[model samples]
Structure formats: C-alpha cells, structure tokens
Target: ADSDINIKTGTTDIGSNTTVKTGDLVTYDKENGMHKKVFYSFIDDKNHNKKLLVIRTKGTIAGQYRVYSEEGANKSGLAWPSAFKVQLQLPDNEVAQISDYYPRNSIDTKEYMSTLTYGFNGIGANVSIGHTLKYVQPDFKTILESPTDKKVGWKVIFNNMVNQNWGPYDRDSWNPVYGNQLFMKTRNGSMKAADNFLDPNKASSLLSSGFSPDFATVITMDRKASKQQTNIDVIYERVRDDYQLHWTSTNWKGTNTKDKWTDRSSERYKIDWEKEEMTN
Candidate 1:
C-alpha cells in the first residue's frame, strides 16, 4: 500500500495520468496540470486520537481535500489545503469516495507534510509538478502558503471506522448510488470521526460499506476572484450504528473575518524558467 504513495519535497517531474479524470476544470498538459496528492493516516498519539489527511491537486490548484480527526488535531501545512471546497471542481455527476483511512503513513517521523502524485520522479519526464517548468517553481513551502489561484473539480474522501462493527445505518437508508448513509452526532459531541471507519455494504450489498478505497469528505471555501458555486455534497461514513446520516449546504459561509481562503494569484510561485522550456 505504501508503494501506491509517492513523496516529493521539492520540484518533481510527473508525466501524465490518463486515469486522473480531468473533466473540464483541470488538465494533464505534457508539462503542467495536476501534480500533488497525499494520503497520510496517523495518530495524535500524545493527544490520544486518530487522524488522517488526503489531498489531490492540479498544478498549483487544489482539486480535492479531506482531513480526519477522531479526537483531536495539531497544526500542519495541511491547514492550507483544508480550507478548500474541492467538490466544485468535480464533474457534476461524479462523486469521489473515501472508503478507508487506517492504512498508509504520512511518508512519518512526525509522519510528514507529504507532497506527491502521478509522474513524480520519472526518468527524464515531461511534466513538472503542476506547471513547474512553465509557470510555478519548486518551492514546497511557498506552494503550501500560496495566496491566490482557485482550482476546479476537486473532491476529498472520508469514511467511518469499521473493524469494530460500527457501520452505516439502516438497510433502507443506505443509498447504493451516492453512498450517502453518512453519520455523525452533535457533529462534535459526536465520538465519530477518523477513528471508527465502517463498511457501507453492512446496510445493503449495492450500498457502500465505507471501506473500499474509494471515499471523500466535505469542507467550505470562498473564491476571491471567482464566482460562487451551488450544490455542496458530503457523504462521510461514521463509526456508530445509531447516528448514520448525511449533510448538505444550500448556501456559502456567513461567519468569518475573511471568508476567502486566498487573496492573490498563483503568479508568485512562478520561476524564471524561460530557458528551461526552450529546450523541451
């Protein structure tokens, strides 16, 4: 499973991923497109809680993101990506799934601030992480704190813990299609989070058992220079038998000093690579 994950701390070359579902909001240019993605699962050990982080990006744009917390969390560069609403980048009909979270390490000593994906480290590859040779540079830190540029069609995955019997609610309740038998209590009064992942099929065969390696989560975002999008959807699998549920928001955020996650454009990360591209 660890082999499926890649780790890159600086500018890396990733070729192309035909399977990455580009839709209309993203691209897979020979040199620039989507490049970073990470799946880190860990424990807050000292805090006595479980945690997870999943991310997918296009060039420098965030396409999908999800964070998991069973009991707590600590600070991380991940906080930057967490603020995005990735589903907007997805094609209207496609719903990303987060089937499990107990596997994979964050790359970890303290785990890691993983930066990964498609063509990372290929032999004489064509593409650079998102548009490195063309637009962006390979500064991991600067990329994380990027102040501008919104992405398209990104989604995150979330699942309830299973192994202990916790599962999606009633049989009639599980949606075989949307896999929407998500559950939670008081939201926070809820002991449900990344700790107790469950199998969505526990409710029905066609339904999700919440543990298939396909899952996603929900978050909020405001575009500083972009238009607002309607229809936010979330289907998180909770780890209890009693509180299986679903969540939806009709409008955007209302309470914040600055509702937008970014205020500038991605031009800052661009490198002076005019000479690098001339040869390619």
Candidate 2:
C-alpha cells in the first residue's frame, strides 16, 4: 500500500534555488482528507537531475496537491517545482494479488531488472549480503526513482530509505508497477503471470471479488555495456501455487479447495557448478 505514493523535490526550484532537502515535510490537501508525508532527496546532485524527490505513499490513500500553497510562498508566492513523476519498480520473479489491481507482495515476479533473477540463498552460496561475489551482490540501498518519457517498462523496489535513487518523470500518469511482480525470461514457454498463484478454481475466484485474472506487459531494455543491447518483453502473470484461502467456497465440500500459485519465469542461464550445467 505504501509503494505507490512518492514525493519529488526539484533540483532547480524554478525561480530561486528550488533544491528541496531530504526528509522535508510536504502536505497534500484534498477534498476528502489531507496527507502529511516526508520527502527523500536524491544523491549525486546533478543539474540534469530533473527529479527532485519521491514520496512513499500508501496505496490509493495519497492525493495530488499543488505547490502554490500560502505556507511556502515567496514574493511571487511559491513557484513551480519542475513538474516531474516518480516510477515504482517491482522486484523480479515475484508475484502478488493486490486488492486493487496487483498485489504488492506477490512472488510471481521471476525476472527482476531484466535477466537478473533473485536466486534463493543456498548452502555454500557465495552471494550474501555484504559478501559480494560474481553476479551476487548485497540487496541494500537499491534505489528506484520515477521514470520519465525517456524511460519506460522499468520498475523499482526501494531496497532502503533514501539510499537508493533513480531518475525523474517526464509526464504525469506514469503509474509504475511495484510489488513482488518482477521480470524474467521464460526460456520454455509463455505462461500467464497469475496462473499458479493458488489453484485454478481459486485463482478464477478472484475475478468474482473484483480482481483481474489477466496479465500485463511492458517493454524493457538491458543496461549492461557488454551484454547484447536489445529490448525484451516483461510480463506480469498470476498463478495458484501458494497458501490456500479457506471457507469462501463450500461447493468443494470434502475436497481441498485452497491452493497456492506463484509467479514463475521462462528459464534462467546461471552457471551452477553444483548442477554441472546452466541452472535456473
């Protein structure tokens, strides 16, 4: 719920020095209610850094407010803080069934940040937090800033507070997908994102209660320098494979109706000395 809403502070605060500081308090007053949230500034102060800061909002609870408030205005009243947007990036290989559209904590995301999948911590695993190895790094301070028109199809999962920052937003309505819904390459075949999240019957049941059973897609690119630079497809699917939801359906009667479904990926090509071949 806190993943969607974000606050932005401007580098060039339009007229005067519009650089807003991190942890600054910004309030949004709406017809319904008012929200008070803190702003986390971006590091590496660059003039081209059009983005100011991002606000961590609680799902659907946050509203938009204009900067022309009387509390913080100058001779010209308050100027505009460079219109920008914040993007939300979902982790890879995880999936979720959000009460609204997508769940924020689903394990169906299989491919995160393009080809990179979050492999489980296995025995003899060289990749652990603070113990960086090849292809294995600590999951700390990973930043996710909003995406502008210049970039799309990419999402971010805030690893830490203000420690992880990305870029700015070009236009409004850039609803970035954040949740467990991640990126992955299905080496075998294309499967729906929410397919195995639970059981076929239970997964279909989410439709009746107002959840979408269909999947979504977006275009993404790899940022690596040596790797082949190409645009790939990042799909969000839901399946039935995890825990079970009980009682809601008595038609199953004596049968176990509840099931678990997770987000699975196509395939992964990781060199595993334990498996003797490229393992997923």
What lDDT does the true structure give each of the candidates? Answer: 0.24, 0.23
Q: Write the per-residue lDDT of candidate 2 for residues 140-252, one digit (tens) a residue.
A: 21222333323222222212111113322121212222211111111122233222122223221221221211112122222222432222222222222111111112111
Q: Which ten residues in a row have the lowest lDDT in candidate 2?
A: 72-81
Rate residue 109 of model 2 by lDDT.
Answer: 25
Per-model tally of clashing residue pairs: 44, 66
Give me the displacement of residue 223 in model 2, in angstroms. 8.5
Q: Write the per-residue lDDT of candidate 1 for residues 1-280, one digit (tens) a residue.
A: 3334564442242212212211112222223122222221211122212211122222333222222222232111111121222221222432222323222222312322433355535475544333222232111111111111222232222222222245423223333433333322122222223322233333222123111122222222222313332222221111112221222232111111112233222211111111111010
- Candidate 2, TM-score vs. the true structure? 0.18
Error of 1 at 168 (Å): 1.8
Model 1 clashes, total count: 44
